[PDB]
C-alpha cells in the first residue's frame with residue numbers, strides 16, 4: 001500500500017469476507033468509505049465475498065442493490081446470506097414453513113423447495129390461530145396466498161430465513177408446528193420432548209445488529225431465544241434446533257467454498273458463464289489457495305468469534321454493534337479499526 | 353351469603369361468542385339475587401365498555417362496578433408515575449387516560465416518532481396514523497414506568513421498545529445505560545401471567561404470561577440478572593384482595609346498605625379487606641394455573657370448567673378445584689345446590 005494505490009508484493013493470495021450491516025451499510029445507506037474500500041479491491045482483483053447474516057431477498061437482488069449504492073460491481077456469486085445454505089435442504093424437506101418477511105416465499109421457491117408455506121398463509125387461513133397478529137386486511141391480501149392441502153399434508157420442517165415482522169403471530173405459528181402431531185396443522189401432541197415435532201432451522205443467532213438507529217437492535221438470535229423460551233416452558237426440555245449463519249462452522253465452510261470458486265473466476269481459471277456448483281453442507285473445501293482470509297465485521301459474537309473458530313483472521317470495526325471498550329470475551333480480533341476502509345488498507349499494508 | 357367470581361375467556365365467552373349456558377348462568381344468579389363479580393385477566397377497554405358489551409351479548413345487566421380486568425388495579429398507580437409507557441392494544445391508551453394517568457405514551461407513538469427504533473414492526477403507515485398520537489417531548493421528558501395493560505399486537509416492536517425503556521438511562525428515550533443490573537431503569541408492571549388462554553380456536557393460545565417470559569428472557573440476556581418486575585392479575589394476592597374489596601362493595605349495593613348514586617371508592621393496592629362477609633366465594637375458571645391456584649391460595653372455593661384452557665385428563669399437578677364440571681351453568685347450579 002502507498003497512499004491510495006495498492007501494489008502486489010507477493011504471489012501469496014489474501015482475501016476478505018465482509019459483513020454488510022454495520023460494516024458497509026446502516027440500513028439502505030452506505031457507510032462512508034465502504035464504496036472506496038470495495039473499489040480498491042475490485043481495481044486490484046483481490047478476491048472477496050460478502051458474508052452476511054442479513055437476508056430476505058434473492059442473492060442477485062441483494063448484490064444488484066449493493067452494486068448500485070456503492071458504485072461498484074458485486075456479483076451475485078460473491079454473497080452468502082443467512083439463508084443461502086438452505087439451498088442445500090431442498091431435497092430433504094418437501095413442504096416447509098418458510099418464516100421471514102413475505103419476500104422469503106419467493107426466495108425459497110427460487111431455491112427449489114417443492115411446497116413453500118409462509119407464516120402469513122396460516123393467519124390468512126384462520127385469523128384466530130394468531131390472536132395478536134398485527135396484519136391489516138391490506139397486508140394479509142398482499143403477503144399471503146391460499147395454499148392447497150394446507151390442513152391435510154404434513155409440514156416437513158420450519159426454516160427461518162430472516163426476521164419476520166409480526167412476532168406474536170410468527171412465534172405462535174412456529175410453536176404450533178414444533179409441538180404438532182407429526183407436522184399436521186391444527187394438532188397438538190400429547191407427549192413432551194426436547195425433540196420438536198418437525199425440525200427447525202434458524203439462519204442467524206445474532207442477538208444484536210446495527211441498523212440506522214444509534215442503538216443496537218435485537219435480531220434473529222433474539223427471536224430464536226424467544227421461540228426457545230416458550231418451547232422449554234411447554235416441554236420442560238430445551239429445544240433441539242439447527243443453526244446456520246455466522247459464527248457456525250456450517251456457514252464458514254459453505255462461504256469458504258464460495259470464495260474459492262469466486263477466486264477461480266476472478267483469475268480467469270473459470271469462465272464467467274460457467275454455472276456455479278452448490279457446495280455440500282458439512283464439507284470443508286478440498287483445497288485452499290489463500291495465505292489468509294480476513295473477516296471484516298462489527299459483531300464480536302458473530303463475525304469475530306466465527307472467523308476465529310474457523311481459523312481466519314479478522315478485522316473488528318467500530319461502525320456497528322461493537323463500541324470501543326466493550327467486553328470482547330474470548331475474541332481476539334487480528335486488528336481493531338475505525339471502519340471498513342481502514343480495515344482493508346491496514347490489512348493490505350500489514351499482510352500484503 | 354355465597355358469592356361467585358367468574359373468569360370470562362373460556363367460561364362465559366370464546367372470543368366474542370357467548371358459551372352455551374353462560375347467559376342462563378348469570379340470569380340464574382340475578383333472578384336469585386346472588387352477588388358475583390367478573391374477575392378476568394383479559395382487558396383492553398374501559399370497565400364500562402367491557403361490561404356494556406357483555407351485558408348486550410348475554411342479555412343480562414352487568415354493572416361496570418362488577419368487573420375487575422387485568423389492568424383495573426393500575427388505577428391505583430396514577431399518582432405514582434406521571435409519564436407511562438402504556439403497552440397493549442391501541443385502546444389501552446384511552447383506558448389509561450380515563451384512569452387519570454397524566455402523560456400516557458402508547459408504544460405505537462414511538463414507532464410514529466422513528467420507524468428505525470423497531471425494524472421488525474409490522475405496523476402499516478395507515479395503522480401508525482390510526483393507533484398513534486403526536487406526543488410532545490417524547491425525547492426530552494423521562495418515562496416513569498412501563499405498564500403492560502394487555503397483549504399488544506406487534507411484538508417485535510413492542511418487545512424492542514419495552515427493552516429500550518427498562519435498559520435506558522433513567523427512562524430517557526434514545527439512551528442506553530452503562531451498567532447491567534437486575535433492577536430495570538424504570539419499573540415495569542405486567543397485568544396477566546397466563547401462559548395460555550382459550551380464544552375461538554380449538555387449541556390454547558399464548559397469552560400475556562408468554563409475552564412476559566419473552567421480555568424477561570431478553571432482559572436476562574442483556575443484564576446477566578433476572579428482571580425485577582411487578583406482577584398483577586390472577587393468581588396474585590394483589591389482584592384477589594382487590595377483587596375481594598370490589599365483591600364486598602357490590603354486595604353492599606345489591607342489598608341496599610350503599611346507594612347506587614354513591615361513587616365507589618378505589619380500593620388502595622396491596623391492602624386486605626377489613627372484613628370477610630361471605631360464607632364462601634366460588635371462583636369459576638378454565639385455567640388451573642391462574643383461576644384455580646389463585647382462588648386456592650386466597651382461601652376461596654373454585655369450579656373448574658372444561659370449556660376453555662383445561663381438558664379432561666390434564667394433570668392438575670398442584671391445585672384442587674372444589675368442583676370440576678362441564679361448563680359455567682353446571683358450575684353455578686351444582687355449587688348452589690350443594691353449598692348455598
Ligand SMILES: O=P(O)(O)OC[C@@H](O)CO
Pocket residue numbers: 018019020021022023051052053054055204206208209219220
Ligand atoms: O452484519 P451482517 O451483514 O452479518 O448482518 C447482520 C444481520 O444480523 C442483520 O439482521
Ligand SMILES: O=P(O)(O)OC[C@@H](O)CO
Pocket residue numbers: 359360361362391392393394395544546548549559560
Ligand atoms: O379467563 P380470563 O377472563 O381471566 O381471561 C384470560 C386472559 O388471559 C385473556 O387474555
Ligand SMILES: [Mg+2]
Pocket residue numbers: 019020021022023209210297298299320321
Ligand atoms: Mg453486522
Ligand SMILES: [Mg+2]
Pocket residue numbers: 134135136139474475476479
Ligand atoms: Mg400490521
Ligand SMILES: [Mg+2]
Pocket residue numbers: 359360361362363549550637638639660661
Ligand atoms: Mg380463561
